[PDB]
Please model this.
Amino acid sequence: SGISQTVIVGPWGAK
Amino acid sequence: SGISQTVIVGPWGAK
Amino acid sequence: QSGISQTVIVGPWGA
Amino acid sequence: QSGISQTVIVGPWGAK
Amino acid sequence: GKAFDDGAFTGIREINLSYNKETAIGDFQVVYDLNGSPYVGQNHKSFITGFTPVKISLDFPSEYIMEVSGYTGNVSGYVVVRSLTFKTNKKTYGPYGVTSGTPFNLPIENGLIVGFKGSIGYWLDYFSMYLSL
Amino acid sequence: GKAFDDGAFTGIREINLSYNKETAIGDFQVVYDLNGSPYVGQNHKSFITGFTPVKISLDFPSEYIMEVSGYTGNVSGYVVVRSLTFKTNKKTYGPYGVTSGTPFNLPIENGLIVGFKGSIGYWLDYFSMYLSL
Amino acid sequence: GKAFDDGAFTGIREINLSYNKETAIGDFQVVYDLNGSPYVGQNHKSFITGFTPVKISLDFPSEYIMEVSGYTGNVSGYVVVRSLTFKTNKKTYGPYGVTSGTPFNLPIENGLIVGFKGSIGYWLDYFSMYLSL
Amino acid sequence: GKAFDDGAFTGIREINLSYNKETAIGDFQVVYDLNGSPYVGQNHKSFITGFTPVKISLDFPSEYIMEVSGYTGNVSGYVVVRSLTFKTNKKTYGPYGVTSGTPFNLPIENGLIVGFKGSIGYWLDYFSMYLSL
Ligand SMILES: O=[N+]([O-])c1ccc(O[C@H]2O[C@H](CO)[C@H](O)[C@H](O)[C@H]2O)cc1
Ligand SMILES: O=[N+]([O-])c1ccc(O[C@H]2O[C@H](CO)[C@H](O)[C@H](O)[C@H]2O)cc1
Ligand SMILES: O=[N+]([O-])c1ccc(O[C@H]2O[C@H](CO)[C@H](O)[C@H](O)[C@H]2O)cc1
Ligand SMILES: O=[N+]([O-])c1ccc(O[C@H]2O[C@H](CO)[C@H](O)[C@H](O)[C@H]2O)cc1
Model:
């Protein structure tokens, strides 16, 4: 894949 | 500088 | 230490 | 999606 | 709620949110930085109105967020994000909304928030943050 | 307490920690991955002894941590980390310690914990995590 | 010439360039991906005209560039980029321009080109590439 | 030749290589940094002897590599790395070896070389570099 990636933290909130 | 870096999250706890 | 995200940059070629 | 971190890698230069 | 995902950008210039102390966070919109220019993200609106608007206008790129905190709780039988605070290297913004329910907090020692995703119904249901160096 | 900083590695093979059911988390040591080989981290021990040890052996590389949670609160007048819980894509480990005070949690949607830093006195005072892709 | 810097994006959808088989590369414009949507970059245009246009339309996101190569050499007293070639996982685009002078190449084993910067006067004088995971 | 892959580290402290002024680069070994400690990489040895050693001892962390360049070319019928030059923010080291064949170069505008991989038989056959921020 040609889409770059980033860290993601979460989610906070509802399921 | 010649030092690689990284994402750091926190701290949790005292101080 | 600013608010601008950074990324690796290679080059330049040419010149 | 694994537990191994990864890194950009450029090259190789030299033999194919 | 309706899911949203802004994706990742180069930084944050302004956060427009709204909230109601009786309930929770409502609307959420971000003006990102994209390679030195403002990127006006889509306004993710509560299905309802009646919120107080907040504009967090950052001194980009000198000022950046160093901590995001808040509370989740029950509103009308729904678990939602009730309150948010944004601490920068310059000032604290918030809390916006009542600080009651289960706390959470994301302090950043190194790195930047560069994106938001989540879901908003009547209220902000949940969110996540993209981080980068 | 005594500060520590493991820095960043290429992922996590094992977490060893210790705790007491009435105070808080005591000792902390991580076996990291480095470039596909095990790297045994420094063992960050409490100033005191008497804790219950726990070894969390991950099936690396298919198993990785997706959430770290716990509680902070006061033990003998100090804010410390009272409980920890590690949730991976396979299983939950913990909680270890005393689950009261103020909760915190770091879920990760994309990315990996690759290092820890913090401070331990009689108990774990605070900690932070290095994240990477 | 006129310096340009697109900055970094999510990926590359299309590259437009122009060249002349007796001089060098002239114009340069990229359609980037930005978080799954096309973002049409600034068109970096030569001071002169009469070049032959080329549209490289990638099958994003499955097709991505794995190698950029080219030549630099002197044209009318100016050392410029005379030729460019783009190798993807699907096929090779080019060479465009004149393949004479000093070669260069950037193969990528892991990672993605996500932006371009450089300078263009009558011809493309030089360029650099933003790389990301 | 024999493949090697050091992986990624935090930085580079020293490079130990050997070369022959009539052939190509032979041995290659790197002292990395790993979170503030020297990490002695494995010595990657040529299958033959008769090289001249050289020790590139960087003033880490204030000194770092900004450009690796060199030449690939035929020795005894094999394409090998004939020459290497390391330019830092402080000094240039090299060229080491023979400056003939096809030139290559990897200048870095932003980021760091944090690892090498490749293959060595009689001479260095090929190499790649890990890059980070
Ligand atoms: O009549 N209401 O007050 C009310 C409240 C919440 C409702 O649900 C919608 O919003 C929820 C909270 O944000 C959640 O997103 C849910 O999925 C939505 O249907 C509906 C009516
Ligand atoms: O006699 N005490 O129960 C007691 C407990 C803790 C003390 O401080 C040490 O531990 C603290 C919490 O871990 C903190 O690290 C402090 O800095 C340490 O000196 C002292 C006495
Ligand atoms: O009389 N000419 O063929 C000629 C060519 C190029 C000139 O300069 C412009 O292009 C240069 C090479 O790309 C360089 O960018 C320069 O700064 C431009 O003004 C002028 C005359
Ligand atoms: O005739 N020789 O001097 C000679 C040179 C190289 C040979 O092969 C070994 O080295 C090669 C280039 O480094 C390549 O790695 C090959 O796979 C090695 O066996 C044999 C004879």
